[PDB]
Amino acid sequence: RPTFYRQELNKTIWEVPERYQNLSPVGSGAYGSVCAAFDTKTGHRVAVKKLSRPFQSIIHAKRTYRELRLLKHMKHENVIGLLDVFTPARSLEEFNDVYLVTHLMGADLNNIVKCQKLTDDHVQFLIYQILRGLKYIHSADIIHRDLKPSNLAVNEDCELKILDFGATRWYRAPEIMLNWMHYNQTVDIWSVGCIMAELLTGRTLFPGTDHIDQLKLILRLVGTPGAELLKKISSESARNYIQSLAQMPKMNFANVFIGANPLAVDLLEKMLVLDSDKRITAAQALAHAYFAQYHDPDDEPVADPYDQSFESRDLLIDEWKSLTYDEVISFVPPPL
Numbered sequence: 001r002p003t004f005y006r007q008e009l010n011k012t013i014w015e016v017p018e019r020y021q022n023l024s025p026v027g028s029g030a031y032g033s034v035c036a037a038f039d040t041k042t043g044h045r046v047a048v049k050k051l052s053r054p055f056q057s058i059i060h061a062k063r064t065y066r067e068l069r070l071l072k073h074m075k076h077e078n079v080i081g082l083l084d085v086f087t088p089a090r091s092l093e094e095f096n097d098v099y100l101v102t103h104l105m106g107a108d109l110n111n112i113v114k115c116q117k118l119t120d121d122h123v124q125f126l127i128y129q130i131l132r133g134l135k136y137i138h139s140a141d142i143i144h145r146d147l148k149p150s151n152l153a154v155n156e157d158c159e160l161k162i163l164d165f166g167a168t169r170w171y172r173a174p175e176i177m178l179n180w181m182h183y184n185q186t187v188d189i190w191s192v193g194c195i196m197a198e199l200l201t202g203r204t205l206f207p208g209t210d211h212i213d214q215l216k217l218i219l220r221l222v223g224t225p226g227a228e229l230l231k232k233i234s235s236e237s238a239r240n241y242i243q244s245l246a247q248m249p250k251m252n253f254a255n256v257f258i259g260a261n262p263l264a265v266d267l268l269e270k271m272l273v274l275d276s277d278k279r280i281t282a283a284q285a286l287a288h289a290y291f292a293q294y295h296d297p298d299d300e301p302v303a304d305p306y307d308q309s310f311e312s313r314d315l316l317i318d319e320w321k322s323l324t325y326d327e328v329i330s331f332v333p334p335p336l
């Protein structure tokens with residue numbers, strides 16, 4: 001067990017191993033309780049996040065568990081990984097505080113776009129990397145559900161990591177804003193479509209004042225729902241609403257991206273599909289011709305089996321808090 005040290009940072013008690021020095025608060029608050037540190041073991045900068053009110057309720061307890069269970073699983077170049085998870089607690093009796101260590105983020109994809117006007121070489125490479133990360137995540141039966149530029153970290157090499165820091169609206173698949181039952185991984189693909197369009201056009205594709213405004217901007221671009229789609233909505237009320245919000249004059253798809261590489265527009269067209277059963281998968285996307293320059297199949301792995309069975313459980317804080325401790329004590333850092 002390592003030696004820890006106390007610290008007040010913005011009226012917040014920060015106890016960490018001494019290997020993590022120069023803790024400095026980052027994200028102006030909005031990213032939760034996060035500090036930039038210096039990993040003295042490796043001499044790189046890192047992010048320490050102290051988890052906030054982690055065992056307050058069943059929901060918070062179970063959510064603390066899922067996160068640690070997820071971070072510990074992600075061993076892929078285009079997805080966030082865990083360098084370190086620690087607690088000051090010398091026992092389960094005392095366990096209340098959880099700290100997570102990751103690479104420090106230099107820029108989100110948002111910052112990138114503010115900095116520079118991206119080329120088609122950039123857009124190919126960036127989207128290739130998101131779809132690669134998604135192929136891995138999807139293989140483990142994990143859906144991101146909140147893919148957006150602020151959750152995409154991008155380095156000096158334009159190398160990219162998918163993460164979730166916790167406007168979502170702009171990038172959200174339409175089935176979710178209509179609260180339909182059926183939900184597949186391709187909700188993420190919709191988001192990649194929205195993100196890619198933004199990288200091509202430099203503007204929010206569906207900049208919707210509210211969710212109803214959003215759904216109008218979508219349906220005028222991706223068409224009044226087809227016979228095929230409507231034949232999969234159950235409620236008369238829902239079907240009448242969906243076709244009721246598709247009363248904006250229809251728009252021409254390729255018109256919206258005049259100037260873009262046609263191979264890009266071709267790909268966008270297979271991502272921004274109303275019918276999620278007919279929307280392309282991450283693994284198919286990787287084989288699209290727009291990624292000729294990068295797409296290597298032998299180098300686009302799937303994840304290992306991910307035990308998600310805890311998702312279905314109604315347990316007590318002390319079960320959640322105990323399963324969490326198990327996972328903290330038993331963590332094995334990645335190699336350097």
Ligand SMILES: CS(=O)(=O)N1CCC[C@@H](NC(=O)[C@H](CCC2CCCCC2)NC(=O)c2ccc(CNc3ncnc4c3cnn4-c3ccccc3)cc2)C1
Pocket residue numbers: 026027031034047048049063064066067070071079080100101102103104105106137142144162163164165166
């Ligand atoms: C459903 S739920 O309810 O469980 N759900 C609630 C909302 C938050 C969700 N988070 C996660 O479950 C994911 C892990 C799940 C994976 C993520 C990848 C896709 C597949 C699923 N967790 C993460 O992705 C994460 C991110 C950062 C950290 C710590 N690291 C930083 N935390 C803040 N800020 C930072 C840094 C680094 N740099 N910066 C930074 C910020 C600003 C400026 C400079 C640097 C820790 C964890 C969980």
